[PDB]
Ligand binder design. Structure first.
Ligand SMILES: CCn1nc(C)cc1C(=O)Nc1nc2cc(C(N)=O)cc(OCCCN3CCOCC3)c2n1C/C=C/Cn1c(NC(=O)c2cc(C)nn2CC)nc2cc(C(N)=O)c3oc(C)cc3c21
Lengths: 309, 309
């Protein structure tokens, strides 16, 4: 409705043309009794056991990710596989009602059939269905936030940064490390400053220019037992402020479980980009955390600081 | 490898546990000849015809989107459905080799079975499989670019903008319209300035402040036949510079077909956000274009300008 090449969203034409081929194929059965209907649900059973066997093998992948992806909860993992046990398991019981009115040997034939369907890669997802699951969930916001952060901000501020650090040391007493530490709070909730987030980190300063775009940089000196054992540059992650603010934007249904699944994905993608980047080979260093026994993040920065040298 | 709650990417444990249940179910067949193997491919045929029927009904959706999503090319639409005709159609012919060694009535039983499987929503995609297709393609960069553009930039610059426009008119001769026009070139290729992109648009100016964050909004006056019939504020789309620069970033396999599928998706999502936004009810106005007979975009801005009043 904006440009003729702009694709409109998907409609219900998949369901619409489904009943047409249903009504076409149903009247062919009128071309020939009642003997078919016991065979119909038995074949309809075999589609469900194939889907049920496709769930349990994918469950073997999921137990690798019980702690991270599913917070140690065994019930969510079974709920994550198999789609919907209600609409699947109901027709499975209805089949055995019709099945009575060498079964394991008959059951074993469909067993290995679905195995090679997975092994040969025959369970293919079409690029129509691959696309239609991607534009369905409007909050797929994780790779765009990672890729635009590297392109728009990190590609620009990192190669200049080493010169802005050394001129502060030529200006002086306090030796600041030559890396950029980006904090990634998973409980996203980003405040404006950092003195209130931890009173162990209570500096403020402005990193000077080179001597266009003006990226103000503040150096926060850790005050381990009231003493600045470490001085460093700390910035938050501006994409995490967006992920927070979409959840507060209640006109879009973005919940705190949907936010936490992307913020973990945002750190994995941003760790990938800084692996093979020309500029961040030794400059960037992400410090992710999620504090509930809420410990001090000033310690874990100092662990990342003393591991530098 | 960064935090213990950060989920690792998926492995080949789906294929790994598939052969284990294959080797388990195969030796149960040793517990009982050769009579099963003709029945096995016949059941393996019925899975493919169900997938083939699932492709053709989804094709009925795709013909609504032949021009936009598939550039008018009928062959891509069939290639977009059904996944892979090579690995699917080969086993279909191999079945009929085994089928010879009321068939349409037997074929009609599996026909309406897959219809109600689509009609009742029984073809469910599990949230494990829904997720694993989303983190597979690392360039899913369309909604993050739209949502962060509204949050980080458009939510901040639009409610201030009306005051910055009127003070230019109080300063004066030239009545500038009270809207923001964002250009979305689909052939993304964004240049730095706009005088070279069209010599019909050749102003430069700086929109003044209110009298924190400083945004330079340049006012470009249309020079219809060398005369400034229209004066307006034109900005490009900074997310489209990123989508271009990921394609030039050849370490990530982002091709010009992958870029063009997201840039169309970026404009549909950004049109959605400005529909139900409190600030952009009459301020923003997107002008998307893709020029090959490459016409002048200064005309289509003036069409959007004279349609205002
Ligand atoms: C953000 C929404 N968005 N999403 C996508 C995708 C594209 C855009 C977008 O439209 N960006 C944008 N175009 C603008 C045009 C003007 C103009 N006409 O003047 C002004 C702007 O804002 C003035 C400076 C900002 N000030 C100071 C910094 O905080 C805010 C106020 C503009 N901005 C705001 C963002 C600018 C970049 N930017 C970032 N951004 C990110 O890291 C980020 C996170 C995600 C996700 N994507 N990115 C993009 C990389 N952090 C910044 C911090 C400092 C700093 N410390 O000084 C700093 O200095 C400059 C020069 C830029 C800069 C920053």
């Amino acid at each position: 409705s904006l440009h003729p090449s702009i694709p409109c969203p998907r409609g219900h034409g998949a369901q619409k043309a489904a009943l047409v081929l249903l009504s076409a194929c149903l009247v062919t059965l009128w071309g020939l009794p009642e003997h078919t209907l016991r065979y119909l649900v038995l074949h309809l059973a075999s589609l469900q056991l194939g889907l049920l066997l496709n769930g349990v093998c994918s469950l073997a992948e999921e137990l690798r990710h019980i702690h991270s992806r599913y917070r140690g909860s065994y019930w969510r993992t079974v709920r994550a596989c198999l789609g919907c046990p209600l609409r699947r398991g109901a027709l499975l019981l209805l089949s055995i009602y019709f099945y009575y009115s060498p079964f394991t040997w008959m059951l074993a034939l469909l067993g290995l059939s679905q195995a090679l369907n997975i092994l040969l890669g025959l369970k293919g997802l079409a690029p129509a269905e691959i696309s239609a699951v991607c534009e369905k969930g409007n909050f797929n916001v994780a790779h765009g936030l990672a890729w635009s952060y590297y392109i728009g901000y990190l590609r620009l501020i990192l190669p200049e940064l080493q010169a802005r650090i050394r001129t502060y040391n030529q200006h002086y007493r306090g030796a600041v490390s030559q890396r950029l530490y980006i904090l990634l709070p998973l409980d996203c909730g980003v405040p404006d400053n950092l003195s209130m987030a931890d009173p162990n980190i209570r500096f403020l300063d402005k990193l000077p220019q080179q001597t266009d775009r003006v990226y103000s940089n503040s150096i926060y000196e850790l005050l381990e037992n009231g003493q600045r054992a470490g001085t460093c540059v700390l910035e938050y992650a501006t994409p995490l402020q967006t992920l927070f603010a979409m959840s507060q934007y209640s006109q879009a249904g973005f919940s705190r479980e949907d936010r936490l699944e992307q913020a973990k994905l945002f750190c994995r993608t941003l760790e990938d980009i800084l692996a093979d980047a020309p500029e961040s080979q030794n400059n960037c260093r992400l410090i992710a955390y999620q504090e509930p026994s809420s410990f001090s993040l000033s310690q874990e920065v100092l662990r990342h600081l003393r591991q530098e040298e």
